[PDB]
Amino acid sequence: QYVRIKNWGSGEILHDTLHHKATSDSCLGSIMNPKSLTRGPRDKPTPLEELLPHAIEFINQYYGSFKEAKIEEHLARLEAVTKEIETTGTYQLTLDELIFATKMAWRNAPRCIGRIQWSNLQVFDARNCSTAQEMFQHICRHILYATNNGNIRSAITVFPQRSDGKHDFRLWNSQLIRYAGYQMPDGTIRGDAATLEFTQLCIDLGWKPRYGRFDVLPLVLQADGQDPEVFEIPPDLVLEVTMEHPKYEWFQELGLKWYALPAVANMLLEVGGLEFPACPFNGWYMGTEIGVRDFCDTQRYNILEEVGRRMGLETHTLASLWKDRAVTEINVAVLHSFQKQNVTIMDHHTASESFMKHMQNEYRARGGCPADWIWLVPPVSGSITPVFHQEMLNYVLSPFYYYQIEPWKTHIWQ
Amino acid sequence: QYVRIKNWGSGEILHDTLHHKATSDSCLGSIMNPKSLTRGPRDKPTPLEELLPHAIEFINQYYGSFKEAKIEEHLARLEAVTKEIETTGTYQLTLDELIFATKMAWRNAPRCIGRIQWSNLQVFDARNCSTAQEMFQHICRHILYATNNGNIRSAITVFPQRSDGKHDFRLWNSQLIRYAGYQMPDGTIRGDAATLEFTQLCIDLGWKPRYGRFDVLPLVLQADGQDPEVFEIPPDLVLEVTMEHPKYEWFQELGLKWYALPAVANMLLEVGGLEFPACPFNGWYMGTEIGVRDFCDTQRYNILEEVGRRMGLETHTLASLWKDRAVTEINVAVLHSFQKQNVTIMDHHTASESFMKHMQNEYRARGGCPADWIWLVPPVSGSITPVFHQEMLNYVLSPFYYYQIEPWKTHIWQ
Ligand code: HEM
Ligand code: HEM
Ligand SMILES: C[C@H](O)[C@H](O)[C@H]1CNc2nc(N)[nH]c(=O)c2N1
Ligand SMILES: C[C@H](O)[C@H](O)[C@H]1CNc2nc(N)[nH]c(=O)c2N1
Ligand SMILES: N/C(S)=N/CCC[C@H](N)C(=O)O
Numbered sequence: 001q002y003v004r005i006k007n008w009g010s011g012e013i014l015h016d017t018l019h020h021k022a023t024s025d026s027c028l029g030s031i032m033n034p035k036s037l038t039r040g041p042r043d044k045p046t047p048l049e050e051l052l053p054h055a056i057e058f059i060n061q062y063y064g065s066f067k068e069a070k071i072e073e074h075l076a077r078l079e080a081v082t083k084e085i086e087t088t089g090t091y092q093l094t095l096d097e098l099i100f101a102t103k104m105a106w107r108n109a110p111r112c113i114g115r116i117q118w119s120n121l122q123v124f125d126a127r128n129c130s131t132a133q134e135m136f137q138h139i140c141r142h143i144l145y146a147t148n149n150g151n152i153r154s155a156i157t158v159f160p161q162r163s164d165g166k167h168d169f170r171l172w173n174s175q176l177i178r179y180a181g182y183q184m185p186d187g188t189i190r191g192d193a194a195t196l197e198f199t200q201l202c203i204d205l206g207w208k209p210r211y212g213r214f215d216v217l218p219l220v221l222q223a224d225g226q227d228p229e230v231f232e233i234p235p236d237l238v239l240e241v242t243m244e245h246p247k248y249e250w251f252q253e254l255g256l257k258w259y260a261l262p263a264v265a266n267m268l269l270e271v272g273g274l275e276f277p278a279c280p281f282n283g284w285y286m287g288t289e290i291g292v293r294d295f296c297d298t299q300r301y302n303i304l305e306e307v308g309r310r311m312g313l314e315t316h317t318l319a320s321l322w323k324d325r326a327v328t329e330i331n332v333a334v335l336h337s338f339q340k341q342n343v344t345i346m347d348h349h350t351a352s353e354s355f356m357k358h359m360q361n362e363y364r365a366r367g368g369c370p371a372d373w374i375w376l377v378p379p380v381s382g383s384i385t386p387v388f389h390q391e392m393l394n395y396v397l398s399p400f401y402y403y404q405i406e407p408w409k410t411h412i413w414q
Numbered sequence: 415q416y417v418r419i420k421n422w423g424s425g426e427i428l429h430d431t432l433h434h435k436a437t438s439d440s441c442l443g444s445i446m447n448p449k450s451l452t453r454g455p456r457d458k459p460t461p462l463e464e465l466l467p468h469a470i471e472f473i474n475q476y477y478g479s480f481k482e483a484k485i486e487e488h489l490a491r492l493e494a495v496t497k498e499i500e501t502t503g504t505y506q507l508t509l510d511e512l513i514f515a516t517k518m519a520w521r522n523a524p525r526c527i528g529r530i531q532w533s534n535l536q537v538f539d540a541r542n543c544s545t546a547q548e549m550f551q552h553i554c555r556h557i558l559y560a561t562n563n564g565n566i567r568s569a570i571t572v573f574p575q576r577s578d579g580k581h582d583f584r585l586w587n588s589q590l591i592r593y594a595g596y597q598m599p600d601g602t603i604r605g606d607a608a609t610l611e612f613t614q615l616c617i618d619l620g621w622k623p624r625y626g627r628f629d630v631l632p633l634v635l636q637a638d639g640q641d642p643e644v645f646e647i648p649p650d651l652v653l654e655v656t657m658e659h660p661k662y663e664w665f666q667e668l669g670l671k672w673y674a675l676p677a678v679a680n681m682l683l684e685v686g687g688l689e690f691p692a693c694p695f696n697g698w699y700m701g702t703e704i705g706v707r708d709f710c711d712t713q714r715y716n717i718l719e720e721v722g723r724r725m726g727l728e729t730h731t732l733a734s735l736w737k738d739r740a741v742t743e744i745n746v747a748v749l750h751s752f753q754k755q756n757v758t759i760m761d762h763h764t765a766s767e768s769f770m771k772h773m774q775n776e777y778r779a780r781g782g783c784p785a786d787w788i789w790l791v792p793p794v795s796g797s798i799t800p801v802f803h804q805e806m807l808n809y810v811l812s813p814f815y816y817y818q819i820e821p822w823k824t825h826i827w828q
C-alpha cells in the first residue's frame with residue numbers, strides 16, 4: 001500500500017506514496033531495520049525439506065574449507081547429520097563447526113568494519129545451558145574474558161539453538177553493557193535516551209533506578225521459554241573510561257565516561273538451517289561510535305552544544321563550522337582517554353584502511369565481500385576515508401547475524 | 415555473469431562473484447553510474463505507442479497541477495499533442511510546459527540537496543538552436559546570467575530535443591566551468607586530475623595547453639550530429655574565488671582558488687517520452703564540494719597532506735585526527751573566501767536543515783521525495799547532519815535528469 005519511513009533523529013514517521021509512480025527500470029538501502037535483515041519468531045520447528053538442504057550446503061561449505069579436505073569425514077558427517085536430522089528433527093554442530101559458523105557469520109556481516117579480524121574470534125559454547133542464572137554466568141565469563149583488563153578481545157558466547165520456536169533463549173538488552181535513560185521530573189532526560197523504553201521495562205521488573213547519567217543497565221535474560229529474570233551486572237566486571245581531552249583540561253569537568261566493551265546482545269545467528277536467537281558477541285570500539293554517535297547524536301547524550309560553548313565557538317552560527325570543530329575534539333578526547341587508560345580502540349581512519357585491506361583479501365580469496373556502504377562509512381570525514389570512494393554490494397549470505405523482533409513485543413506472560 | 419565494482423579512489427576495478435550465493439530475500443545503492451540511472455544513444459525515433467502514453471501522462475501531470483485546472487485546454491492540448499504526435503512523430507512542448515518539466519525533473523533528482531529551491535529556476539529555451547557556435551552563445555548567456563557577479567542564480571538552458579538519435583546536441587564537458595589536468599613530464603600531475611582524459615581530448619582537437627593548476631577548460635560542443643567544435647570560454651565570464659583562511663594568513667600562500675559556478679553539463683532531461691541530451695543547469699556551491707571533495711580527494715587537488723603540515727599536525731599518525739582538523743579548516747577557508755568576496759554559497763549544515771524542510775513540504779504535498787542517502791549526506795560530519803538519521807527511498811520518477819554515456823565513446827567521425 002505504502003512505505004513507512006522513520007527519522008531516527010526526531011523519531012518522526014512518514015508514509016511514502018510516490019514510489020508507486022516509479023519507473024520500469026526503489027533501493028531500501030537507507031532503511032535501518034528492513035524485514036530482509038530480520039529473522040522473527042516461530043511456533044513450529046524448521047520443516048525437514050528446508051532444514052536438510054541448508055544443512056548439507058553448510059556441511060559442504062565447512063568441509064570445502066580446509067586445505068586437503070577430509071572427504072571421508074565429509075561424506076560421513078553429511079550422512080551422520082542427514083541421519084541425525086531425520087531422527088531428531090534438528091541437529092547439533094561439531095564444536096569446530098560452530099567456530100567456523102560464527103567466524104563466517106561475522107565475515108558475512110555487511111555492516112561491520114572490523115571484519116579483517118574475522119579469523120581472530122573466541123567462541124563460548126553455551127549450547128548445553130538451560131537456566132537464566134546459568135546464562136548470566138556465561139555472560140559474566142564473557143564480559144570478563146572480553147574486557148581482559150583493557151586489552152579487549154573479540155568473542156561470542158553461543159547459547160542453545162532454536163528448537164520449536166517457543167523455547168528460545170533471548171537477551172532482551174541491546175548490548176551487554178549499556179547505560180540507562182530516565183525521563184526525569186523536571187521534563188529533562190538523564191543518561192542514554194536510546195535505552196528509555198527498555199529502562200522502564202527493567203523498572204517494571206522491579207529494577208532499582210539509580211537515576212544517573214551512567215548507570216549500567218541490568219541483564220534481562222530469558223531461558224527456554226520462561227519469562228525474563230533480571231540480573232544486575234557486577235560493577236567489578238564493567239570497565240569504563242573517563243573522558244579527558246589532551247589539551248582542554250576543562251573537558252574532564254564534563255564528568256563524561258563510557259564503557260570499554262561494545263558487545264551486541266540481541267542478534268540471531270543463522271547457520272545450516274538452524275538458528276540461535278541468543279549469541280552476544282563483541283569486538284572493540286572505533287572512536288566515532290562514542291565520540292560522534294553516542295556523545296553527539298540528538299537522541300543520545302547530545303553534548304555538542306556545550307562542548308562548543310566551552311570551546312568558545314559561535315554556537316549560533318551554523319556557517320562557522322563549530323560543530324565540525326567540536327566533534328573532532330570530542331573524538332580526540334575519546335581516543336586519548338582510551339589510549340591513556342590502555343583500553344583497545346581504533347580511530348576511524350586506520351579502521352577504514354584496514355577494511356580496504358580486508359576486501360582486497362576477501363575478493364581475491366572467495367570472490368566477494370557483502371558491504372553496506374551506508375553503514376561502513378564513518379559518521380564523520382566520510383570522503384576523507386577510502387571506503388567512501390569504494391563501490392560495494394550489500395547482500396545476505398549464510399551463515400549470518402540477523403536482527404530480530406524486540407522480544408518484549410512477542411512474549412508469553414505466565 | 416558477475417558484477418563489476420570500481421574504487422573511485424585508486425581507480426581499481428573488482429569483479430564480485432559471491433553475490434550469486436545470496437539469499438531468497440543485492441542493493442546497487444553504492445554504485446556511482448548504474449545503467450538504471452543512465453539514458454544512452456539511439457538510431458531510431460521513439461516508437462509512437464510508447465511516446466504517446468508518456469506524452470499523455472506528462473500532459474496530465476502538468477494540467478493536474480494548477481489550482482482550478484483548465485480542463486478545456488487540458489483536453490485540447492491532449493488532443494493537440496496526440497494529433498501533433500501522429501503527424502510529425504515527436505512533439506513540441508509549450509514553453510510553460512518545459513518550465514514545469516525542468517522544475518519537476520530537478521524536483522525528482524534524488525542526488526541533489528538543493529531541491530528546496532526547485533521552484534526558483536530560470537529556463538533558457540534554446541530548442542530552436544542549430545549550430546555549435548549558437549550553442550556557445552546560449553552557454554555564455556547562461557554563465558553570465560547564472561554568475562550574476564557573485565549573487566549566483568539557478569538556471570538551465572534547454573537545447574534541441576532528441577529527433578532520430580543521430581541528430582543529438584551534446585556538451586562533452588562534465589560541467590560548464592572546470593579546470594584542466596595535465597600529466598606532466600616529471601611524472602607529477604598538475605591541475606584537476608579528474609579532467610585528465612577529457613583534457614587530452616581538448617588537446618587532440620588542437621586546444622592550447624596552458625599548463626597550470628587552474629586552467630578553465632574549453633567548451634567542447636556538438637550540434638545536430640556534426641562533430642565537436644572547440645570553443646574557449648571568455649575569462650571575463652569565468653568568476654573565481656581565491657582561497658584564504660580567516661586566521662591562517664599562510665593559507666593564501668597555497669595559491670588556491672576555485673570557480674564560483676557549479677553547472678552540470680553532460681546530463682539528459684527526460685520528459686513525456688521526449689529526451690533532451692543537452693541541457694546544462696546550475697545551482698550554487700555547498701562548501702564541502704570544494705573544501706572536501708575537490709580540494710581533498712586523492713583523485714583531485716589532494717591538498718590535505720600540506721594543509722596538515724603547515725598547520726603543524728602529526729601527519730604521520732592517523733590516530734591524531736589531523737585529517738579531521740585540516741579538512742575543517744579548508745572548509746572554513748572556502749566558506750570564508752566565498753563569503754568575503756560576496757559569492758553565494760551554503761555550508762553543509764544549513765543545507766541539510768533546509769533539505770529536511772524540503773522533504774516535510776514534499777511528503778505532505780505530493781506524498782514522497784526520491785532521495786539517495788549515499789549522495790545527500792555530506793562528505794564530512796555525516797551524523798552531525800539531520801539527513802544522516804533520515805531513512806529515504808531512492809526511486810526514479812519522470813521527468814528526470816539521467817546520466818548519459820560519455821559522447822566521445824559513441825561518436826561519428828566525418
Ligand atoms: C574486532 C573489532 C570490531 C570492530 C572494530 C567492529 C566495528 C563495528 C562497527 C564500527 C560497527 C557499527 C556499530 C554501530 O554503528 O552500531 C559494527 C557493527 C557490527 N559488527 Fe563489527 N566490529 C568488530 C567486531 C565484531 C565481531 C567480533 C562481530 C561478530 C562476531 C561483529 C559483528 C557486527 C555486526 C553484526 C554488526 C552490525 C550491528 C547492527 O546491525 O546493529 N563485529 N562493528
Ligand atoms: C540551488 C542550489 C543547489 C544546490 C545547493 C545543489 C547542490 C547539489 C549538491 C551538493 C550535489 C552533489 C554534487 C556532487 O557531489 O557532484 C548536487 C547534485 C545534483 N544536483 Fe543539485 N544543487 C542545486 C541546484 C540544482 C539545480 C538548479 C538542478 C537542476 C535544475 C540540480 C540538479 C542536480 C543533479 C541532477 C544532481 C546530481 C548530479 C550527478 O548525479 O552527478 N541541482 N546538487
Ligand atoms: C537512516 C540511516 O540508515 C541511519 O541513520 C544510519 C546510517 N548509517 C549508519 N552507520 C552506522 N555505522 N551506524 C548507524 O547507526 C547508522 N545509521
Ligand atoms: C562509491 C560511492 O558511491 C561514491 O564515492 C560517492 C558517495 N556519495 C557521494 N555523494 C556525493 N554528493 N557526491 C559524490 O560524488 C559521491 N560519491
Ligand atoms: N565496535 C563495535 S563491536 N560496536 C558495536 C556496537 C557499539 C555501538 N555503536 C556503541 O557506540 O555503543
Ligand SMILES: N/C(S)=N/CCC[C@H](N)C(=O)O
Binds near residue numbers: 676677696700703
Ligand atoms: N552545487 C552544485 S549544483 N554542484 C554540482 C557539481 C559541483 C561539483 N560537486 C564540484 O565540486 O565541482
